[PDB]
Amino acid sequence: DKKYSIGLDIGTNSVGWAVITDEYKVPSKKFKVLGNTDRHSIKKNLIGALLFDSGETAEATRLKRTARRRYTRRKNRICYLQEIFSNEMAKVDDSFFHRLEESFLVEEDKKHERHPIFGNIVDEVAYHEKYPTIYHLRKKLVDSTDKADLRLIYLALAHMIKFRGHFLIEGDLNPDNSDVDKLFIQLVQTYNQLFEENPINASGVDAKAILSARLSKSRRLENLIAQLPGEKKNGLFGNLIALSLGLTPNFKSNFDLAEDAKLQLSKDTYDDDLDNLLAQIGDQYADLFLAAKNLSDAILLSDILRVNTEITKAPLSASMIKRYDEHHQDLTLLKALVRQQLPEKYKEIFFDQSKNGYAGYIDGGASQEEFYKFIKPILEKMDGTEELLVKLNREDLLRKQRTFDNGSIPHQIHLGELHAILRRQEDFYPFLKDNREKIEKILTFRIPYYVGPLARGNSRFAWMTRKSEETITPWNFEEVVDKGASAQSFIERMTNFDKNLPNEKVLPKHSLLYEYFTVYNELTKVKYVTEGMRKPAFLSGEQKKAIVDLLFKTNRKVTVKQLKEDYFKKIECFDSVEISGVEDRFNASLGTYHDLLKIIKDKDFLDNEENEDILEDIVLTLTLFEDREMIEERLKTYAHLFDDKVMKQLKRRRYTGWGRLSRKLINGIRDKQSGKTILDFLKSDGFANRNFMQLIHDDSLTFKEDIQKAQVSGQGDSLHEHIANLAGSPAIKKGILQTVKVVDELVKVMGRHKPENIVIEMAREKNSRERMKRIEEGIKELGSQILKEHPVENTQLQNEKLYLYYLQNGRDMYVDQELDINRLSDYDVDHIVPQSFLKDDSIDNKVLTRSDKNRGKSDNVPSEEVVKKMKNYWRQLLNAKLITQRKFDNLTKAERGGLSELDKAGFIKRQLVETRQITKHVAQILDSRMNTKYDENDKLIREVKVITLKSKLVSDFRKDFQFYKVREINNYHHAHDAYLNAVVGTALIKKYPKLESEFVYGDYKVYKATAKYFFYSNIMNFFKTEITIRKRPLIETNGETGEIVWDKGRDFATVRKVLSMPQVNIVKKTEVQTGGFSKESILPKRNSDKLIARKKDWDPKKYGGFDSPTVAYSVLVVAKVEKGKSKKLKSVKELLGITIMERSSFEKNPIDFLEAKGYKEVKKDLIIKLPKYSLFELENGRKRMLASAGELQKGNELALPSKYVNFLYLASHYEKLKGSPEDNEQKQLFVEQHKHYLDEIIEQISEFSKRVILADANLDKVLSAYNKHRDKPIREQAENIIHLFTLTNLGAPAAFKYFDTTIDRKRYTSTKEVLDATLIHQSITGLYETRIDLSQL
RNA sequence: CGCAUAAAGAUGAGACGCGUUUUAGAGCUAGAAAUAGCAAGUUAAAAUAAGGCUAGUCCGUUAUCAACUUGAAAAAGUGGCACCGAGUCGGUGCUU
DNA sequence: CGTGATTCCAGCGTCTCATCTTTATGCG
DNA sequence: ATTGGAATCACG
Ligand SMILES: [K+]
Ligand SMILES: [K+]
Ligand SMILES: [Mg+2]
């Protein structure tokens, strides 16, 4: 019956827990030990931590799943093509497709001739001589007119269909037009022929280079406008240019059309949009648009083709043949030049696959860039290589046809080549003539993103509904698949249900019912005052309806002045109006009402009550579907009500956005007695004018009970389901679930007595590629040449100062100057918001400057003068996305007011008050689980108070009272943080019950700038003996009550004693490994049993395969095996290591599995399943965690005494020095007086390593390295001993560096010993254990 | 408390481009062979987690997971306390 | 000739679309 | 980045 509290520290890979009592002491208990060993009891402290691998997101699984679907559907494309061809192919060659299928198999496994295409050596050689690449064949079939072998036609069509290109361009691309300059001049011609007053003159402008520039589209537009004399990017010609290049231009202001009429060429809606714009102005400008379309084509077609198109209808295949021919010519030239000038390197270039020369480029793993890096010095160190070098710097030297950059080829080009082949060969082959659209559809068919997987009820990811029960081929897809239903289910399966009625789906945000609801909700709060009024009074239902009919239904926004004049003055005849409860501009407005009024031009239809469900369906359809065709399909039912043009205008309108209130919630549920819905009450409440909340918070009204009935239905969810529904990372969700489980186990351990308080705190927690892409886009948009000055590696951009330099165009952000790339370690990285106000260290808040003093004052936002200097530069960076909206607002906050003392107070408070929503959700879960009893009046009984702390409170407590944390010693700090949290948190609610509303979970009613500033600055000052000097009492009092919240004479002793306890329950969560079967790399054939066949029949020794399988869990099996020629049965105990691929086969029948592996007469009761991280104790406390069936991890924690931890913190100058010069001097002197600690610390590590780690060579290496550097400053030795602690850590062995020396991993690559050790099964807290003596088996 | 914007993250769908693996693309000459010299090289088929049954243009890498007992499962149930101490927890007393 | 030390190695780039939450910053 | 799988190397 002893009161206690729980403190928790939740992280992504750790959950620290601690149980404390009223005196801040951690209890200890004797726990029963189950199993077959002699040990029966163990004393353990109720402080510990759970360690687990981070929870992964589903994104990688999603990408693998989508890739699997794409491979299945590509094989289906080829299958459809072969089905079309099969009847005629069986005549031409019956075994052709069989050879294609078996082409992977080796000679002895092939059932037909080893040559796939023609089945004889002569014809195969002749084919490969005539068409060196498939593109030769494609060009021949597109251009030639004599009948081709059916096998060749199939091969070309299959190549086009299999690798078809992207669908990022909608409509048609005609490759007949490729000249940029000619089409640009034609556009200018049409513009001048239609516009004579201000003609466009652009002669003498390199249209080809500017428009096809490698820079960004926006910068290309800027460059073209720059060379356009007397033109504007927002002008009509500028809009045409933006449309052509790809940027979406607004054509409203060009013609003053009063509608946006945005025209994006790539989008399919453009056509319809274009027609709309033709209705806005006329057909005279249509020619310009036509030219713009053609111009756009050339812009995107000159990028990939770069070949003449008047002589061929296969510009892509001809471009690839040009690649082939230039590669051949350059290869011959390079061979000759190398054999003439550097004859010794030829073998390196053209024979050595390991090297990145031509042989490595073709036969080895060298990419194009690696080959260019290898060959550029050789080209430079030779004569006659000017053309080769020019090609190389243009990235056009010795190219391959199948390259990384073929991702810019639209499927329209492949479709054009396929269509040309079909037209050429259709007369010779009738089935090609009558299956032409079939094959074109095979190439171009693509399941819409809103239909998803074409499942038949066996997929958890599928939502499509089928009109008819038939197989969905690409040809009957539009007939078998219900696309409207599929798209609606696509949107609605991801959208929310309203919380009040969890089975009901939310309304569209722009629903007329929702707008009416919000308008009435705000209007019921309108408190008008006019002359002759004794007291302020609310408006009545009739007045509200009159105002809605007058103000809202005729004005988009309704203000106070319009309310006073057009209603109170015009009708009420009251010239003195003062409003209360609202602002000048009403937030709620009938935007949907006015938009529908403009679209349909009818008022009776809108105001009619009985047809409003039609409007609800209208807005729902306009919200659900973005495609004009589907909107048309759904609205066709309402075509009779409106006109055809009105139907088109409706089709154009789209209402993005959903709400949070369902239809039933607003106007579906009715009160038992009144029979009025919530909307009805909002319309006519009476004198009360209650809002929606008061309407659902009234006990007399049945709405509260109806909501409760809806909420109870479904009984919430299981803990795992409720946690998964949270908005957070899967890693933090794993942390939260483990936190709840440890709390349940701790409550069990404490005799089912629930804690008095649960104080919880959560941590706030490739990249180089993201930085590279961001800087590339920013520089391209800006138009700078900085990146061309210096090619920076991705890992080199990981430097903070370098990244800031590159993001700022190399220029100081506060003044107008330039920084030097080589003057690093000299400039200053400053924070836009000072670290005192906000502890933010991300790039979004950091600025690189030559000297920080240029910012102005260091106690506020940077000065107004700096803003006036660099606002244009900041805006240019923001438009290039080198700085964000947040960064720009922070930088320019001075001109908008700067930082008032109120903002400083708020930032000070938020450094201690945890406002994160995820922490509130965790607190709610814990409170709901702990507090369940209800009052007689149906009110929660807060038996357990859930407090939420921030990491700053505990961190500052650690720093102030020398409770220093070094994260490298061991994992105990996790546990320690949890303890400290409770120790702080409970203390706070002892000292400040009035502050519960900021810390304890629950809506407590307990609630100038300098006052709050100093209050929260010194809110934790009751712990320290001497303030500022002020000497608060030794024993702090509760305040207005008599309790000992803190006893400075003995409570600090208790905290220091707790942090020095050697036994802390650190548990690594044992997990069965799931995921990929093995390494994905397909290795070449070799005679090794570690190769895994990629198919049943693909024997690895002849076809290669996978290796490195991941072990799901090991299996301790005691059985017999055959030994010797006589195959005598030897008894063996062994770890098998069931891999992920073998797991299902093993669990289906373990005995059959083990007999297949070779073990005989296994004991199914003696088989032990051992997941990863299974704990074993061997001797002297040496603990090994099973990492796999053949590898062990360290499983021991080093309990370094607290004095060494504090000395290493001070000596390392953790986070530099943040103390007063007097205290810093005292601590530095303490370090100097305590140099000998270093030796002692080393001894600690050494003795620990001699008992547990057992890495003899690494320990000797470490000792020698330490002896080498004994003359270094104490600080550097301290930092490097912090590094040294990696030798003794728990978990996987790692490599560490002591100064210069690097000590590599000593790995325990043998699990033989653990077969005769003590396996330990630990509960989540580790308090409950079962020890199995495996040597007894 | 309500709107607008931006960023980040989560989830799902539809698609591209490569990469890899085996086979095909008769390598030739001098050679007894070792090999040497020369020539050639750019392409394609197929697989792209083994595979499964539910046979779909589906599904197969997320989440969840100590032990023991009751179980389809979800899951439920199983382990005295106090005190003195502390090198990973030990001991003493009370109790059962 | 086993066995500990050592070395090496690991699928990756892009685009379109939708929904949700959370945080930051204005406005109100 | 990490950390287990695999091959290879050095050597008593
Ligand atoms: K797992
Ligand atoms: K466990
Ligand atoms: Mg497959």
mmCIF file of N, CA and C in Angstrom, chain A residues 825-906:
data_model
loop_
_atom_site.group_PDB
_atom_site.id
_atom_site.type_symbol
_atom_site.label_atom_id
_atom_site.label_comp_id
_atom_site.label_asym_id
_atom_site.label_seq_id
_atom_site.Cartn_x
_atom_site.Cartn_y
_atom_site.Cartn_z
ATOM 1 N N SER A 825 36.028 27.361 -41.583
ATOM 2 C CA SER A 825 36.379 27.401 -40.165
ATOM 3 C C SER A 825 36.610 28.822 -39.664
ATOM 4 N N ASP A 826 36.314 29.828 -40.482
ATOM 5 C CA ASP A 826 36.510 31.228 -40.127
ATOM 6 C C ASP A 826 35.213 32.013 -40.045
ATOM 7 N N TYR A 827 34.269 31.769 -40.949
ATOM 8 C CA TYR A 827 32.993 32.463 -40.897
ATOM 9 C C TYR A 827 32.174 31.976 -39.704
ATOM 10 N N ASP A 828 31.083 32.684 -39.431
ATOM 11 C CA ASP A 828 30.240 32.411 -38.276
ATOM 12 C C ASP A 828 28.861 31.953 -38.729
ATOM 13 N N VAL A 829 28.369 30.886 -38.110
ATOM 14 C CA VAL A 829 27.007 30.411 -38.311
ATOM 15 C C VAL A 829 26.154 30.974 -37.184
ATOM 16 N N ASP A 830 25.183 31.807 -37.539
ATOM 17 C CA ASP A 830 24.339 32.489 -36.573
ATOM 18 C C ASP A 830 22.912 31.978 -36.702
ATOM 19 N N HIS A 831 22.131 32.188 -35.650
ATOM 20 C CA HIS A 831 20.733 31.787 -35.625
ATOM 21 C C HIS A 831 19.850 33.012 -35.804
ATOM 22 N N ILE A 832 18.879 32.911 -36.714
ATOM 23 C CA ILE A 832 17.943 34.012 -36.927
ATOM 24 C C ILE A 832 17.129 34.264 -35.666
ATOM 25 N N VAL A 833 16.667 33.200 -35.025
ATOM 26 C CA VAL A 833 16.075 33.271 -33.692
ATOM 27 C C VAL A 833 17.148 32.852 -32.694
ATOM 28 N N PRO A 834 17.552 33.720 -31.767
ATOM 29 C CA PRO A 834 18.659 33.379 -30.868
ATOM 30 C C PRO A 834 18.358 32.128 -30.056
ATOM 31 N N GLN A 835 19.425 31.407 -29.707
ATOM 32 C CA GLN A 835 19.269 30.126 -29.027
ATOM 33 C C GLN A 835 18.530 30.267 -27.703
ATOM 34 N N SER A 836 18.596 31.441 -27.074
ATOM 35 C CA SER A 836 17.873 31.648 -25.824
ATOM 36 C C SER A 836 16.366 31.585 -26.036
ATOM 37 N N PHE A 837 15.868 32.207 -27.107
ATOM 38 C CA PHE A 837 14.431 32.206 -27.360
ATOM 39 C C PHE A 837 13.955 30.849 -27.859
ATOM 40 N N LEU A 838 14.728 30.221 -28.743
ATOM 41 C CA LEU A 838 14.308 28.990 -29.404
ATOM 42 C C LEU A 838 15.537 28.154 -29.710
ATOM 43 N N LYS A 839 15.560 26.920 -29.205
ATOM 44 C CA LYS A 839 16.680 26.006 -29.437
ATOM 45 C C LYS A 839 16.428 25.241 -30.733
ATOM 46 N N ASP A 840 16.695 25.915 -31.850
ATOM 47 C CA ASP A 840 16.546 25.342 -33.183
ATOM 48 C C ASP A 840 17.892 25.402 -33.889
ATOM 49 N N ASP A 841 18.382 24.245 -34.337
ATOM 50 C CA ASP A 841 19.683 24.157 -34.990
ATOM 51 C C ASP A 841 19.595 23.638 -36.419
ATOM 52 N N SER A 842 18.403 23.598 -37.004
ATOM 53 C CA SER A 842 18.259 23.156 -38.379
ATOM 54 C C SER A 842 18.663 24.267 -39.343
ATOM 55 N N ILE A 843 18.882 23.877 -40.601
ATOM 56 C CA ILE A 843 19.324 24.825 -41.621
ATOM 57 C C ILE A 843 18.292 25.923 -41.830
ATOM 58 N N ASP A 844 17.020 25.634 -41.559
ATOM 59 C CA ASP A 844 15.958 26.610 -41.762
ATOM 60 C C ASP A 844 16.095 27.828 -40.858
ATOM 61 N N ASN A 845 16.920 27.751 -39.815
ATOM 62 C CA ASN A 845 17.087 28.835 -38.861
ATOM 63 C C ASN A 845 18.521 29.338 -38.776
ATOM 64 N N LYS A 846 19.440 28.777 -39.557
ATOM 65 C CA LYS A 846 20.856 29.103 -39.475
ATOM 66 C C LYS A 846 21.296 29.850 -40.725
ATOM 67 N N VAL A 847 22.156 30.846 -40.533
ATOM 68 C CA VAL A 847 22.657 31.686 -41.613
ATOM 69 C C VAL A 847 24.169 31.794 -41.480
ATOM 70 N N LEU A 848 24.873 31.611 -42.592
ATOM 71 C CA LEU A 848 26.321 31.759 -42.629
ATOM 72 C C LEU A 848 26.673 33.201 -42.968
ATOM 73 N N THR A 849 27.499 33.823 -42.129
ATOM 74 C CA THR A 849 27.903 35.206 -42.315
ATOM 75 C C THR A 849 29.403 35.329 -42.094
ATOM 76 N N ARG A 850 29.981 36.380 -42.675
ATOM 77 C CA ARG A 850 31.393 36.659 -42.443
ATOM 78 C C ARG A 850 31.653 36.965 -40.973
ATOM 79 N N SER A 851 30.785 37.763 -40.354
ATOM 80 C CA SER A 851 30.880 38.064 -38.931
ATOM 81 C C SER A 851 29.478 38.306 -38.392
ATOM 82 N N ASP A 852 29.182 37.715 -37.231
ATOM 83 C CA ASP A 852 27.824 37.755 -36.690
ATOM 84 C C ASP A 852 27.377 39.174 -36.361
ATOM 85 N N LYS A 853 28.322 40.070 -36.067
ATOM 86 C CA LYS A 853 27.966 41.414 -35.630
ATOM 87 C C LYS A 853 27.213 42.192 -36.700
ATOM 88 N N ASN A 854 27.246 41.731 -37.952
ATOM 89 C CA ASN A 854 26.488 42.377 -39.015
ATOM 90 C C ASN A 854 24.987 42.168 -38.880
ATOM 91 N N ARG A 855 24.544 41.249 -38.020
ATOM 92 C CA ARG A 855 23.114 41.013 -37.856
ATOM 93 C C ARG A 855 22.415 42.152 -37.128
ATOM 94 N N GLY A 856 23.151 42.954 -36.374
ATOM 95 C CA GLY A 856 22.554 43.948 -35.501
ATOM 96 C C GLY A 856 22.595 43.494 -34.048
ATOM 97 N N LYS A 857 21.467 43.623 -33.359
ATOM 98 C CA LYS A 857 21.389 43.241 -31.957
ATOM 99 C C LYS A 857 21.175 41.738 -31.825
ATOM 100 N N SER A 858 21.822 41.144 -30.827
ATOM 101 C CA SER A 858 21.792 39.703 -30.622
ATOM 102 C C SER A 858 20.661 39.247 -29.708
ATOM 103 N N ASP A 859 19.802 40.158 -29.258
ATOM 104 C CA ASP A 859 18.715 39.828 -28.345
ATOM 105 C C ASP A 859 17.345 39.859 -29.013
ATOM 106 N N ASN A 860 17.290 39.883 -30.342
ATOM 107 C CA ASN A 860 16.030 40.030 -31.061
ATOM 108 C C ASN A 860 16.234 39.554 -32.496
ATOM 109 N N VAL A 861 15.232 39.793 -33.336
ATOM 110 C CA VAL A 861 15.294 39.519 -34.768
ATOM 111 C C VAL A 861 16.346 40.448 -35.362
ATOM 112 N N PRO A 862 17.045 40.051 -36.427
ATOM 113 C CA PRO A 862 18.079 40.924 -36.992
ATOM 114 C C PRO A 862 17.512 42.277 -37.396
ATOM 115 N N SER A 863 18.378 43.287 -37.342
ATOM 116 C CA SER A 863 17.966 44.681 -37.405
ATOM 117 C C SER A 863 17.173 44.983 -38.674
ATOM 118 N N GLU A 864 16.425 46.089 -38.620
ATOM 119 C CA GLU A 864 15.625 46.511 -39.763
ATOM 120 C C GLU A 864 16.496 46.965 -40.926
ATOM 121 N N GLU A 865 17.674 47.523 -40.638
ATOM 122 C CA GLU A 865 18.555 47.972 -41.709
ATOM 123 C C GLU A 865 19.035 46.801 -42.556
ATOM 124 N N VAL A 866 19.367 45.678 -41.916
ATOM 125 C CA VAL A 866 19.768 44.490 -42.665
ATOM 126 C C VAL A 866 18.620 44.003 -43.540
ATOM 127 N N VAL A 867 17.390 44.086 -43.028
ATOM 128 C CA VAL A 867 16.223 43.697 -43.815
ATOM 129 C C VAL A 867 16.080 44.602 -45.033
ATOM 130 N N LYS A 868 16.187 45.916 -44.827
ATOM 131 C CA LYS A 868 16.090 46.844 -45.948
ATOM 132 C C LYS A 868 17.219 46.630 -46.947
ATOM 133 N N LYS A 869 18.370 46.147 -46.478
ATOM 134 C CA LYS A 869 19.480 45.869 -47.382
ATOM 135 C C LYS A 869 19.220 44.624 -48.223
ATOM 136 N N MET A 870 18.740 43.546 -47.597
ATOM 137 C CA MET A 870 18.786 42.229 -48.224
ATOM 138 C C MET A 870 17.410 41.601 -48.439
ATOM 139 N N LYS A 871 16.332 42.390 -48.402
ATOM 140 C CA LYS A 871 15.008 41.816 -48.622
ATOM 141 C C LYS A 871 14.857 41.271 -50.038
ATOM 142 N N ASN A 872 15.367 41.995 -51.037
ATOM 143 C CA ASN A 872 15.279 41.506 -52.409
ATOM 144 C C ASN A 872 16.065 40.213 -52.587
ATOM 145 N N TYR A 873 17.257 40.137 -51.991
ATOM 146 C CA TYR A 873 18.046 38.912 -52.062
ATOM 147 C C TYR A 873 17.319 37.756 -51.387
ATOM 148 N N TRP A 874 16.703 38.020 -50.233
ATOM 149 C CA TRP A 874 15.950 36.983 -49.538
ATOM 150 C C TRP A 874 14.766 36.511 -50.370
ATOM 151 N N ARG A 875 14.056 37.440 -51.009
ATOM 152 C CA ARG A 875 12.925 37.061 -51.850
ATOM 153 C C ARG A 875 13.380 36.253 -53.059
ATOM 154 N N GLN A 876 14.519 36.618 -53.651
ATOM 155 C CA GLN A 876 15.049 35.840 -54.764
ATOM 156 C C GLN A 876 15.408 34.428 -54.324
ATOM 157 N N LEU A 877 16.002 34.289 -53.137
ATOM 158 C CA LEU A 877 16.295 32.953 -52.621
ATOM 159 C C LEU A 877 15.014 32.172 -52.344
ATOM 160 N N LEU A 878 13.996 32.842 -51.798
ATOM 161 C CA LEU A 878 12.735 32.177 -51.482
ATOM 162 C C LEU A 878 12.029 31.694 -52.742
ATOM 163 N N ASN A 879 12.034 32.505 -53.802
ATOM 164 C CA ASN A 879 11.448 32.069 -55.064
ATOM 165 C C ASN A 879 12.206 30.884 -55.646
ATOM 166 N N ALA A 880 13.490 30.760 -55.325
ATOM 167 C CA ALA A 880 14.290 29.613 -55.725
ATOM 168 C C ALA A 880 14.249 28.488 -54.702
ATOM 169 N N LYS A 881 13.463 28.641 -53.638
ATOM 170 C CA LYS A 881 13.310 27.646 -52.579
ATOM 171 C C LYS A 881 14.632 27.306 -51.896
ATOM 172 N N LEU A 882 15.591 28.233 -51.912
ATOM 173 C CA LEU A 882 16.789 28.074 -51.097
ATOM 174 C C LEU A 882 16.531 28.453 -49.644
ATOM 175 N N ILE A 883 15.539 29.306 -49.397
ATOM 176 C CA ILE A 883 15.025 29.563 -48.060
ATOM 177 C C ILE A 883 13.514 29.391 -48.103
ATOM 178 N N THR A 884 12.936 29.036 -46.962
ATOM 179 C CA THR A 884 11.519 28.722 -46.892
ATOM 180 C C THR A 884 10.712 29.948 -46.472
ATOM 181 N N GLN A 885 9.387 29.786 -46.440
ATOM 182 C CA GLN A 885 8.518 30.858 -45.966
ATOM 183 C C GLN A 885 8.808 31.189 -44.508
ATOM 184 N N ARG A 886 9.059 30.165 -43.690
ATOM 185 C CA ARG A 886 9.365 30.389 -42.281
ATOM 186 C C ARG A 886 10.636 31.211 -42.121
ATOM 187 N N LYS A 887 11.694 30.829 -42.839
ATOM 188 C CA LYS A 887 12.954 31.558 -42.748
ATOM 189 C C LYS A 887 12.792 32.998 -43.213
ATOM 190 N N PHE A 888 12.065 33.208 -44.312
ATOM 191 C CA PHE A 888 11.854 34.564 -44.803
ATOM 192 C C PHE A 888 11.070 35.400 -43.802
ATOM 193 N N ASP A 889 10.028 34.823 -43.201
ATOM 194 C CA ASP A 889 9.234 35.561 -42.224
ATOM 195 C C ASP A 889 10.064 35.907 -40.996
ATOM 196 N N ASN A 890 10.874 34.961 -40.520
ATOM 197 C CA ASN A 890 11.761 35.240 -39.396
ATOM 198 C C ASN A 890 12.720 36.376 -39.729
ATOM 199 N N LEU A 891 13.366 36.296 -40.895
ATOM 200 C CA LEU A 891 14.330 37.319 -41.284
ATOM 201 C C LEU A 891 13.675 38.689 -41.423
ATOM 202 N N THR A 892 12.490 38.747 -42.035
ATOM 203 C CA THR A 892 11.794 40.005 -42.264
ATOM 204 C C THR A 892 10.803 40.339 -41.157
ATOM 205 N N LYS A 893 10.928 39.700 -39.993
ATOM 206 C CA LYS A 893 10.002 39.960 -38.899
ATOM 207 C C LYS A 893 10.187 41.348 -38.306
ATOM 208 N N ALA A 894 11.344 41.975 -38.530
ATOM 209 C CA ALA A 894 11.591 43.307 -37.985
ATOM 210 C C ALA A 894 10.622 44.331 -38.563
ATOM 211 N N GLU A 895 10.426 44.309 -39.884
ATOM 212 C CA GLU A 895 9.545 45.282 -40.519
ATOM 213 C C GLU A 895 8.084 45.076 -40.147
ATOM 214 N N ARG A 896 7.722 43.893 -39.660
ATOM 215 C CA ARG A 896 6.357 43.600 -39.249
ATOM 216 C C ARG A 896 6.167 43.704 -37.742
ATOM 217 N N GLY A 897 7.157 44.222 -37.020
ATOM 218 C CA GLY A 897 7.021 44.420 -35.592
ATOM 219 C C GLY A 897 8.187 43.884 -34.788
ATOM 220 N N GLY A 898 8.968 42.987 -35.384
ATOM 221 C CA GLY A 898 10.071 42.388 -34.654
ATOM 222 C C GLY A 898 9.569 41.390 -33.630
ATOM 223 N N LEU A 899 10.262 41.322 -32.498
ATOM 224 C CA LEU A 899 9.932 40.390 -31.421
ATOM 225 C C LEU A 899 9.576 41.194 -30.177
ATOM 226 N N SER A 900 8.279 41.323 -29.914
ATOM 227 C CA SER A 900 7.827 41.950 -28.686
ATOM 228 C C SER A 900 8.153 41.061 -27.491
ATOM 229 N N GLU A 901 8.078 41.656 -26.297
ATOM 230 C CA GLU A 901 8.355 40.899 -25.082
ATOM 231 C C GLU A 901 7.363 39.759 -24.894
ATOM 232 N N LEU A 902 6.150 39.897 -25.437
ATOM 233 C CA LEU A 902 5.177 38.811 -25.360
ATOM 234 C C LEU A 902 5.673 37.571 -26.090
ATOM 235 N N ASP A 903 6.239 37.751 -27.285
ATOM 236 C CA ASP A 903 6.781 36.616 -28.025
ATOM 237 C C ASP A 903 7.957 35.995 -27.285
ATOM 238 N N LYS A 904 8.797 36.826 -26.667
ATOM 239 C CA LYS A 904 9.901 36.299 -25.876
ATOM 240 C C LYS A 904 9.384 35.463 -24.710
ATOM 241 N N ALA A 905 8.355 35.951 -24.013
ATOM 242 C CA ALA A 905 7.762 35.194 -22.912
ATOM 243 C C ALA A 905 7.172 33.878 -23.402
ATOM 244 N N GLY A 906 6.471 33.913 -24.535
ATOM 245 C CA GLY A 906 5.885 32.692 -25.064
ATOM 246 C C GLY A 906 6.932 31.663 -25.444
#
